Design an enzyme around this catalytic site. Structure first.
Site, PDB file in Angstrom:
ATOM      1  N   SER A   1       2.757  -3.033  -2.882  1.00 45.93           N
ATOM      2  CA  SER A   1       2.061  -2.091  -3.759  1.00 45.93           C
ATOM      3  C   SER A   1       2.213  -2.467  -5.231  1.00 45.93           C
ATOM      4  CB  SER A   1       2.578  -0.670  -3.533  1.00 45.93           C
ATOM      5  OG  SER A   1       2.586  -0.337  -2.156  1.00 45.93           O
TER       6      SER A   1
ATOM      7  N   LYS B   1      -8.610   3.357  -2.739  1.00 45.32           N
ATOM      8  CA  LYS B   1      -7.967   3.713  -1.475  1.00 45.32           C
ATOM      9  C   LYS B   1      -8.164   5.186  -1.113  1.00 45.32           C
ATOM     10  CE  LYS B   1      -4.558  -0.008  -1.610  1.00 45.32           C
ATOM     11  NZ  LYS B   1      -3.122  -0.389  -1.695  1.00 45.32           N
TER      12      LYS B   1
ATOM     13  N   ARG C   1      -3.492  -2.040  -5.336  1.00 51.50           N
ATOM     14  CA  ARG C   1      -3.195  -3.411  -4.919  1.00 51.50           C
ATOM     15  C   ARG C   1      -3.615  -3.681  -3.475  1.00 51.50           C
ATOM     16  NH1 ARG C   1       2.675  -6.270  -5.925  1.00 51.50           N
ATOM     17  NH2 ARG C   1       1.739  -6.670  -7.978  1.00 51.50           N
TER      18      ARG C   1
ATOM     19  N   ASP D   1       8.345  -1.729  -3.973  1.00 54.45           N
ATOM     20  CA  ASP D   1       7.694  -2.416  -2.857  1.00 54.45           C
ATOM     21  C   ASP D   1       6.761  -3.519  -3.356  1.00 54.45           C
ATOM     22  OD1 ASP D   1       6.889  -2.855  -0.070  1.00 54.45           O
ATOM     23  OD2 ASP D   1       5.042  -1.789  -0.580  1.00 54.45           O
TER      24      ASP D   1
ATOM     25  N   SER E   1       2.934   0.812   3.251  1.00 55.17           N
ATOM     26  CA  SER E   1       4.081  -0.083   3.096  1.00 55.17           C
ATOM     27  C   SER E   1       5.196   0.537   2.253  1.00 55.17           C
ATOM     28  CB  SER E   1       3.636  -1.416   2.486  1.00 55.17           C
ATOM     29  OG  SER E   1       4.723  -2.317   2.359  1.00 55.17           O
TER      30      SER E   1
ATOM     31  N   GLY F   1      -3.107   0.374   5.927  1.00 54.35           N
ATOM     32  CA  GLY F   1      -3.162  -0.513   7.088  1.00 54.35           C
ATOM     33  C   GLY F   1      -4.213  -1.592   6.925  1.00 54.35           C
TER      34      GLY F   1
ATOM     35  N   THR G   1       0.852  -1.224   0.000  1.00 51.18           N
ATOM     36  CA  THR G   1       0.000   0.000   0.000  1.00 51.18           C
ATOM     37  C   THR G   1       0.873   1.255   0.000  1.00 51.18           C
ATOM     38  OG1 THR G   1      -1.673  -1.218   1.281  1.00 51.18           O
ATOM     39  CG2 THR G   1      -1.957   1.170   1.099  1.00 51.18           C
TER      40      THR G   1
ATOM     41  N   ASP H   1      -2.395   3.695  -4.669  1.00 48.05           N
ATOM     42  CA  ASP H   1      -2.327   2.537  -5.561  1.00 48.05           C
ATOM     43  C   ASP H   1      -3.626   1.728  -5.485  1.00 48.05           C
ATOM     44  OD1 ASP H   1      -0.894  -0.158  -3.739  1.00 48.05           O
ATOM     45  OD2 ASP H   1      -1.439   1.787  -2.881  1.00 48.05           O
TER      46      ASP H   1
END
Lengths: 248, 239, 244, 238, 233, 233, 244, 220
Positions: free
Chosen positions: H169, H33, H19, H166, H129, H47, H1, H17
């Site tokens: 994400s 999101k 994902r 990452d 993240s 989270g 995230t 994002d």
């Protein structure tokens, strides 16, 4: 505090509850409501009091309430207090379905609400519900059933009954025509129109002034439907021609 | 919560709310029960059913347990609460004490339930009287009755409701060892007592019998009219 | 019927045969029991409050006797009626103003403060357990977006915005005085709004009072902070009135 | 007429009738005398009997080792306040170890009795108490009413026909301070005798005495224990 | 310190009528007239906003109040009692949206609001409301209009009038109202029904009107009221 | 109409004074304290010969050493006796000893003026107990008899009568009783006075006799041993 | 100004003319009790209460109408002594809670406001009755100086230079008007307070009284103390001599 | 995230994002999101996904109740204080990492709310993240008072940096531009990732699966 108290849950010198009997007077002013039992089914018939030119008409019924998959009820009295009681009846029916995984028997749902109505008359210091209820349904124990409810929490299983305006005159009229264990739904609908036409303030009878709902078991499933105006019009005209055929 | 005092004492020394509840039971339908040698039988008068009503729902004879049954008078809405509360106690007794509930214990519970409602805040007295009928574990027949105040007494033969004084005076002159000699003569004593107040009986009478080993037996109108024909047959023979 | 009574409609807060609440109507007469009159006038630059300051004897400390109250640094009010009920509504108003800034971050508007007090006083109107407050609150303060605001709440629960308001014994007489001034087009400045407020209390009551006989509180655009003029500044406005 | 039903309702004269009616309960019960010296505090009480076959009523009750009471009025209200006085004395000995001063305990009664006189549906305590106690300040005689108002008195008598006892104590009030233990009690009975008519006098069966002070703890004398006090009495003054 | 009454103030009379409710219905009858018309294309609600002093600020307090993005309210009778019913209607609308993630149906909100109004006729130590409510809404591509009275009963209306002379309003409505009216035509006939019982010229501050359609419920600005009021359109 | 805790201009509660009047309608009961035991006598008062006489119990045991006779309202009495039975067992559980007669009477006397409307529990008392009680038992102080009334004023008695003919029976007890009489004379004297105050003649299935003595436990006289003292008319 | 049936039974009920009679009858209870005076000087406050001797048997010091709310706050009560002691305990607890939270002696202006709010809370409900007593509060410090407040059964607090409450409050206030308490020292005030009570006291209606006085100023270092036997009798001697 | 926000000359640009993963396996390829708070304030979420939705919807519900009573546009500080006090009471048990950004009467206001109940007012914030990869873009290219298109490019590059570097994400880049008069909710602003289309289909032939019991129920 005790000076302003109306004292609702108190006995009278004659051994009767005043607030309950005064609530019984409130139902006698409301629309005429009758339900009768037949061999193949069971039906409710009510006088619609909400009659105006500019009414929208959104709901399926005015006084007929659906409570369960196999059960339905009708209302006589105060419409506001009835909306609370009918909502409670839907909750009790679902609590039984959650617990036992089978539809609630007709007698068990009537007694459950009547226990609540009895509680208001005994303790709480509040006014009782001025609503008389007529229940129709089907269970696997007894079959097609009809019940009458009182503000005191008094219930009774009937085969033919009426409550509301001109209730005493209508129940005697139902006592005259009804045949025990031989009445079909076709002859029952003709009997219901006969009583409603005679025991009414404004006679002649129109489709908008009356409301009829039927309950019949079909192909192993309970079918509850409210008869549309065109279906009601035919039942009135069948009795209207019987009025003309009488003079011969 | 409602905490107003309902039942209160009066200048003369009477509890009016209890007395008015005793007026409500008098206005109700008549109920009589007699104690025999092997069977105890109770019956209700003045059914006054419009015949257009199912008589399965308006039955005043209700079994509390396998060996305990009761008939009531007065406000039928109030009695249905007491019956259900007593029925729970019959099963609650079994969970605490493995032995089945006796006639004397269940009557004491109903009386104490009526007594607490005549002294608690916000609560009205129960306007009913109950005829508790059953058998003990010894096999001895029992008959008990309660009242709105919460007092219970054992009886050989008693009546409650409208015309309760008329049936009581009839039972004071009729109840003998010869009257309760056989099982049929105990039932005939009830019907003879019921016909004293009721307006031309036969269909207006509903009574139940129970034996010291067998469960409750509700007799149909076809069986009652057999005794009605027998009582009037012996009543005709005298004149 | 026009003036009919049934049951306990005059003792507890319940409906009369006509649909009037008598106990609520008697609460307005409790405002007039104090024997004081308050006048509020709104200008283009400031909101002004003026009220009688009756000191019957020299035994009383004059500084403590006041009907002008501070709720927030920007919001002030005046109380008319029962002083015991008046202070209770102020302490509640101070609570609601502080709670708004804590929960919502920003400072409470005058519009929302008067609405909140009106909703609390509605509970007294519907419940029979307690009597309505025999007091009247007239709130002043500047909204940082709209400008100067004058609001007034009733014991009945009615709240509204005002260009000019009055409360007390000489309420209905002074409200007629403000109407004549509003009808004519005026250049409402700081000195204009204050002088109109003082003359209103001076013509209706007919006293021509001293600086110690009245109390004035203003909220201006340049100084949004609530300020009491005191005897030093009130006298300056009074000597300027006897000129034209 | 309509203001005499609840404690919450005020009279147009500026009174509460329900508190005044509760004070009548104290006047109906038998009289009791409470007096003090410099070292002792004595309670002398007159006992009542509904019938000659029945025993005499208890008038003096224990509270603590240094505090005792004599009641006048309702019996159930007397025991209810006595249990409160016992509990408060136990709490002080549990927490502080020291015995609770009399002035403190009487103030606690004035706080508890005030509550029901202000709330709706509540009644005042229909009992008058004379409290004898000894702390590190000397002997104490305290008077409590159905109203939360309490009195610190040198000598007092409350109950039926207690006015005659009240007049005797007023004429001998200056004498009490320098009185011997035996003489102090004799002044108490002579006051209690004035309440009774000239037809009857004090006997062993209807007189109870409670003495507390520096010398001994609170002790109640009833039947055979009261007879050393009664012997040596001055003859009846009609 | 306080307690609170547990007993009901509204009780049954010997005749069989609830005394406090009928007096609350008398309270709403002596209020400012309010009209509501459904047009099958939109909903229109108009009320009398007479200030009778000039000194009052007209734009400060509103009688027509929005509940959500598609539901609004218009009343007759008492002001203070209405405001509590607004906050309760707004909270019940949000409780539905948090659970079902769908804008609350108009027929469902009225059932929940009338249930609250039913409580105050049976609950301990409280009087009924002296307010009758007109609820409008738009959902499932259909306009809705309802009426909820002090008793707790709710009725579905095509077009109705409240306040003073409601008997004269409805008789004028059944004479003028027609099925399949346009939204713009609905405002015109709503602003004319209010003229039946008004007296003393209509200005942009004298009345308040709100519209509801597929775009959502919104209150019409005093500039928009000005154009629909100067005799002609 | 007034509250339950209302004082009279005389100086006493109304509800308590009316509860004293309730005893005067109840059945009569005589208790005599002797140096060698305590006897209790009461009339059953049978309304109809159909009712079982063995069912009517007005003398009941609280413990093995204390008996109690009740008068007035029987229903209210059984609540007080049940509470007294628990208190004796609560003291037995905690102190491993039997309670004194004075202590048991004091325990019941605590439930005297515990009635009220406001500031009370949901299941609290609304009215006083209209019951007069006779606590007769033997402890370490010897044979004792106590009398209790609705007010809660308990006192030790040598001879006490409570019921309908309370005034007539008490006067008869005053001229017969003395300090050094026997238990057989106490039972004899109680029965002669009991037949004088009755409306219906004295019979074996009409009375209840119970004696508590220092020798044995609580004893209930059966029909056979009752006729042994009835033969001496 | 008298209503018989209704309107005057409950404290939650308004009268037709807009008054709460239950509060007014509680004000009649304080009128029947003896007079209680308190005069603010240049360097403190002096209290003086006449205590009517009901019986000669009561000890000197019993039924005290002078209370210690805080170590710096005094309390002079009038009316029903039962309610006076209960309001004293609430005032003591209010002063106790302030020191426990903030850590300094409670100002009199804040203490008088918080207790009056508690007094007011008993005048709106049917469940509770208004207090049938009126009381006074006085304190002295270095920053605030001499302060005096009075609270009546309704719940209204005002500042005073010299106040009187009881039987002859009107007759007592006329005597304080002659005094120059703005410039006088509190040692001279005790001398003058004692003589006012002796003039006010009606010795043909009432029997005999006991004089009670209290210090609270710079003389006693801010602490509220009772007047010593030397000063009290010296002021009592002047009270009897000036009477002739 | 990976969620981020920025403050430029006119308003605020928020990035997110799409994902959503269950453990280390992608559950949703296209997930929203950026959440609705008010017609002027929007909030990004990170989270616990169930906690993010219900915390947002509750404050959005309360502010709609708040704006209709006040009769004016809700403030960003009102949205901040509601999120701050509610998350603090649960002591971080509600795992909600939020980036609050909206245009107020006062102006543009950007906040970052942590699950424990701590708020930070900054011109640029990154949460989730891939927050470390997203912040690196801001700490290198950010400048005060930017144009709308220049601000949109910065956030999109910041989210993309968290997407590729990452593992938590991936997929699409979502942007929400809020100004004083214009509100742009570009759902698919940039799609950097594309699935390689199935060139060899394995479509199951009709009647290749064995059936034991069949039951057909007609409908109305």
């Amino acid at each position: 505090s005790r000076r302003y108290d109306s004292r609702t849950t108190i006995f009278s010198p004659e051994g009767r509850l005043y607030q309950v009997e005064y609530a019984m007077e409130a139902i006698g002013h409301a629309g005429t409501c009758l339900g009768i039992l037949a061999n193949d089914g069971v039906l409710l018939a009510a006088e619609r009091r909400n009659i105006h030119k500019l009414l929208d008409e959104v709901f399926f019924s005015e006084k007929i309430y659906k409570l369960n998959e196999d059960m339905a009820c009708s209302v006589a009295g105060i419409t506001s207090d009835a909306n609370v009681l009918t909502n409670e009846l839907r909750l009790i029916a679902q609590r039984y379905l959650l617990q036992y995984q089978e539809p609630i028997p007709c007698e068990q749902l009537v007694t459950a609400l009547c226990d609540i109505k009895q509680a208001y008359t005994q303790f709480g210091g509040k006014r009782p519900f001025g609503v008389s209820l007529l229940y129709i349904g089907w269970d696997k124990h007894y079959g097609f059933q009809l019940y009458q409810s009182d503000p005191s929490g008094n219930y009774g299983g009937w085969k033919a009954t009426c409550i509301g305006n001109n209730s005493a005159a209508a129940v005697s009229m139902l006592k005259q025509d009804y045949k025990e264990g031989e009445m079909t739904l076709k002859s029952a609908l003709a009997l219901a129109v006969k009583v409603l036409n005679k025991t009414m303030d404004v006679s002649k009878l129109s489709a908008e002034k009356v409301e009829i709902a039927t309950l019949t078991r079909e192909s192993g499933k309970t079918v509850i439907r409210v008869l549309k105006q065109k279906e009601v019009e035919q039942l009135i005209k069948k009795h209207e021609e019987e009025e003309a055929k009488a003079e011969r | 919560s409602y905490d107003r005092a309902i039942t209160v004492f009066s200048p003369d020394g009477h509890l009016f709310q209890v007395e008015y509840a005793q007026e409500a039971v008098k206005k109700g339908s008549t109920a009589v029960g007699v104690r025999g040698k092997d069977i105890v039988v109770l019956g209700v008068e003045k059914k006054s059913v419009a015949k257009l009503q199912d008589e399965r729902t308006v039955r005043k004879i209700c079994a509390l347990d396998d060996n305990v049954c009761m008939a009531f008078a007065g406000l039928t809405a109030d009695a249905r609460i007491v019956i259900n509360r007593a029925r729970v106690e019959c099963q609650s007794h079994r969970l605490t004490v493995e032995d089945p509930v006796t006639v004397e214990y269940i009557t004491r519970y109903i009386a104490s339930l009526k007594q607490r409602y005549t002294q608690s805040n916000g609560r009205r007295p129960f306007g009913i009287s109950a005829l508790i009928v059953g058998f003990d574990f010894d096999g001895t027949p029992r008959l008990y009755q309660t009242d709105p105040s919460g007092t219970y007494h054992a009886w050989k033969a008693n009546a409650i409701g409208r015309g309760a004084k008329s049936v009581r005076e009839f039972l004071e002159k009729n109840y003998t060892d010869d009257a309760i000699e056989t099982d049929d003569l105990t039932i005939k004593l009830v019907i003879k007592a019921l016909l004293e107040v009721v307006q031309s009986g036969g269909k207006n009478i509903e009574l139940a019998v129970m034996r010291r080993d067998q469960p409750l037996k509700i007799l149909n109108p076809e069986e009652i009219e057999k005794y009605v024909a027998e009582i009037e047959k012996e009543k005709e023979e005298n004149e | 019927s026009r003036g009919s009574s049934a049951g306990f409609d005059r003792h507890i807060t319940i409906f009369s045969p006509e649909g009037r609440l008598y106990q609520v109507e008697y609460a307005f007469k409790a405002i007039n029991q104090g024997g004081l009159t308050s006048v509020a006038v709104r200008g283009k630059d400031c909101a002004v409050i003026v009220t009688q300051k009756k000191v019957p004897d020299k035994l009383l400390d004059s500084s403590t006797v006041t009907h002008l109250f501070k709720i927030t640094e920007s919001i002030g009010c005046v109380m008319t009626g029962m002083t015991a009920d008046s202070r209770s509504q102020v302490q509640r108003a101070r609570y609601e103003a502080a709670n708004w800034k804590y929960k919502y971050g920003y400072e409470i508007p005058v519009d929302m403060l008067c609405k909140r007090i009106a909703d609390i006083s509605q509970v007294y109107t519907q419940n029979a357990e307690m009597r309505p407050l025999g007091c009247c609150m007239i709130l002043i303060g500047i909204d940082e977006e709209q400008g100067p605001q004058v609001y007034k709440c009733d014991p009945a629960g009615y709240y509204c915005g005002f260009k000019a308001t009055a409360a007390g014994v000489k309420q209905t007489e002074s409200t007629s005085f403000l109407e004549k001034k509003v009808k004519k087009k005026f250049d409402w400045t700081f000195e204009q709004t204050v002088e109109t407020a003082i003359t209103c209390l001076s013509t209706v009551l007919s006293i021509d009072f001293k600086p110690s006989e009245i109390e004035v509180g203003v909220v201006t655009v340049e100084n949004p902070k609530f300020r009491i003029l005191t005897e030093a500044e009130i006298d300056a406005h009074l000597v300027a009135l006897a000129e034209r | 007429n309509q203001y005499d039903n609840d404690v919450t309702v005020w009279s147009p004269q500026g009174r509460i009738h329900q508190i005044e009616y509760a004070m009548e309960a104290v006047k109906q019960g038998s009289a009791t005398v409470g007096l003090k010296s410099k070292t002792h505090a004595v309670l002398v009480a007159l006992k009542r009997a509904q019938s000659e076959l029945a025993a005499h009523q208890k008038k003096i009750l224990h509270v603590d080792n240094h505090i005792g009471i004599s009641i006048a009025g309702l019996t159930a209200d007397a025991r209810l306040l006595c249990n409160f006085m016992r509990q408060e004395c136990l709490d002080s000995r549990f927490v502080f170890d020291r015995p609770l001063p009399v002035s403190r305990l009487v103030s606690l009664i004035g706080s508890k009795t005030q509550i029901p006189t202000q709330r709706y549906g509540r009644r005042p305590y229909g009992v008058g108490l004379l409290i004898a106690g000894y702390d590190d300040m000397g002997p104490h005689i305290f008077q409590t009413c159905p109203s939360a108002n309490y009195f610190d008195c040198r000598a007092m008598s409350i109950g039926a026909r207690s006015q005659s006892a009240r007049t005797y104590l007023e004429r001998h009030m200056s004498e009490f301070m320098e009185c011997n233990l035996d003489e102090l009690v004799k002044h108490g009975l002579r006051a209690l005798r004035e309440t009774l008519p000239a037809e009857q006098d004090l006997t062993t069966k209807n007189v109870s005495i409670g003495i507390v002070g520096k010398d001994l703890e609170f002790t109640i004398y009833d039947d055979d224990d009261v007879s050393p006090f009664l012997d040596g009495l001055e003859e009846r003054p009609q | 310190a306080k307690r609170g009454y547990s007993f009901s103030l509204t009780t049954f009379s010997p005749s069989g009528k609830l005394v406090q409710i009928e007096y609350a219905l008398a309270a709403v009858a002596g209020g400012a007239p309010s009209v509501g018309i459904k047009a099958a294309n939109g909903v229109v609600l108009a009320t009398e906003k007479k200030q009778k002093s000039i000194l009052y600020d007209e734009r400060s307090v509103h009688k027509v109040e929005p509940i959500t993005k598609h539901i609004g309210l218009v009343y007759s009778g008492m002001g203070p009692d209405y405001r509590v019913l607004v906050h309760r209607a707004r909270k019940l609308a949000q409780q539905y949206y948090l659970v079902y993630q769908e804008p609350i149906p108009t027929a469902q909100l009225v059932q929940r609001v009338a249930s609250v109004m039913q409580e105050y006729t049976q609950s301990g130590g409280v009087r009924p409301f002296g307010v009758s409510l007109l609820i409008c809404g738009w959902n499932e591509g259909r306009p809705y209009l309802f009426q909820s009275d002090p008793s707790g009963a709710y009725f579905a209306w095509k077009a109705t009038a409240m306040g003073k002379n409601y008997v004269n309003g409805k008789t004028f409505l059944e004479k003028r109202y027609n099925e399949d009216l346009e939204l713009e035509d609905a405002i015109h006939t709503a602003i004319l029904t209010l003229k039946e019982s008004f007296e003393g010229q209509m200005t942009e501050d004298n009345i308040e009107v709100g519209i509801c359609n597929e775009a959502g419920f919104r209150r019409l600005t005093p500039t928009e009221v000005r154009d629909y009021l100067a005799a002609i359109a | 109409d007034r509250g339950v805790n209302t004082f009279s201009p005389e100086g006493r509660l109304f509800q308590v004074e009316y509860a004293i009047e309730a005893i005067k309608l109840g059945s009569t009961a005589i208790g005599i304290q002797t140096s060698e035991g305590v006897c209790l006598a009461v009339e059953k008062r049978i309304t109809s010969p159909l009712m079982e006489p063995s069912s009517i119990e007005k003398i009941v045991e609280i413990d093995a050493h204390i008996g109690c006779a009740m008068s007035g309202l029987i229903a209210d009495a059984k609540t007080l006796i049940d509470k007294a039975r628990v208190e004796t067992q609560n003291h037995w559980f905690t102190y491993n000893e039997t309670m004194t007669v004075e202590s048991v009477t004091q325990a019941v006397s605590n439930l005297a003026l515990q009635f009220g409307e406001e500031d009370a529990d949901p299941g609290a008392m609304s009215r006083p107990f209209g019951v007069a009680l006779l606590f007769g038992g033997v402890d370490e102080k010897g044979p004792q008899l106590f009398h209790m009334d609705p007010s809660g004023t308990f006192v030790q008695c040598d001879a006490r009568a409570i019921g309908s003919a309370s005034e007539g029976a008490q006067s008869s007890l005053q001229e017969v009783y003395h300090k050094s009489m026997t238990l057989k004379e106490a039972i004899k004297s109680s029965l002669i006075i009991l037949k004088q105050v009755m409306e219906e003649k004295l019979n074996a299935t009409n009375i209840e006799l119970a004696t508590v003595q220092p020798g044995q436990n609580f004893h209930m006289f059966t029909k056979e041993e009752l006729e042994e003292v009835i033969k001496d008319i | 100004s008298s209503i018989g049936t209704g309107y005057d039974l409950s404290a939650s009920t308004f009268s037709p003319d807009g008054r709460v009679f239950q509060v007014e009858y509680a004000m009649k209870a304080v009128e029947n009790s003896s007079t209680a005076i308190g005069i603010r000087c240049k360097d403190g406050v002096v209290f003086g209460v006449e205590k009517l001797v009901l019986s000669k048997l009561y000890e000197e010091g019993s039924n005290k109408r002078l209370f210690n709310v805080d170590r710096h706050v005094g309390m002079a009560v009038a009316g029903l002594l039962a309610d006076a002691r209960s309001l004293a305990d609430i005032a003591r607890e209010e002063a106790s809670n302030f020191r426990s939270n903030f850590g300094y002696n409670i100002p009199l202006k804040h203490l008088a406001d918080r207790v009056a709010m508690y007094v007011h809370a008993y005048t709106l409900y049917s469940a509770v009755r208004p207090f049938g007593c009126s009381f006074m509060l006085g304190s002295y410090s270095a920053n605030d100086g001499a302060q005096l407040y009075m609270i009546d059964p309704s719940g209204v607090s005002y500042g005073y230079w010299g106040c009187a409450i009881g039987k002859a409050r009107q007759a007592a206030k006329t005597e304080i008007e002659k005094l120059q308490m703005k410039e006088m020292t509190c040692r001279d005030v005790v001398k003058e307070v004692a003589k006012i009570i002796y003039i006010v006291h009606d010795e043909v209606k009432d029997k005999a009284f006991e004089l009670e006085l209290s210090w609270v100023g710079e003389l006693t270092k801010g602490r509220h103390e009772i007047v010593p036997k030397d000063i009290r009798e010296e002021a009592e001697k002047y009270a009897k001599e000036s009477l002739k | 995230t990976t969620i981020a926000g920025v403050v430029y000359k006119d308003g605020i640009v928020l990035g997110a994002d799409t994902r959503a993963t269950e453990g280390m396996v992608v559950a949703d390829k296209n997930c929203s999101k950026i959440h609705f708070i008010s017609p002027n304030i929007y909030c990004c979420g990170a989270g616990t996904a169930a906690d993010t939705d219900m915390t947002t919807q509750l404050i959005s519900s309360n502010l709609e109740l708040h704006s209709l009573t006040t009769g004016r546009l809700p403030r960003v500080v009102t949205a901040n204080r509601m999120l701050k006090q509610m998350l603090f009471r649960y002591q971080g048990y509600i795992g909600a990492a939020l980036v609050l950004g909206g245009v107020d009467v006062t102006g543009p206001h950007l906040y970052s709310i942590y699950p424990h109940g701590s708020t930070d007012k900054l011109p640029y914030v990154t949460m989730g993240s891939g927050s470390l990869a997203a912040m690196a873009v801001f700490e290198d290219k950010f400048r005060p008072d930017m144009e709308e298109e220049e601000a949109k490019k910065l956030v999109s590059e910041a989210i993309a940096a968290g997407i590729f570097n990452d593992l938590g994400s991936g997929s699409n880049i979502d942007l929400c531009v809020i100004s004083k008069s214009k509100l742009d909710f570009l759902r698919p602003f940039s799609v950097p990732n594309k699935k390689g289309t199935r060139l060899g289909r394995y479509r199951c032939e009709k009647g290749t699966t064995a059936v034991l019991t069949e039951k057909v129920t007609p409908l109305e």
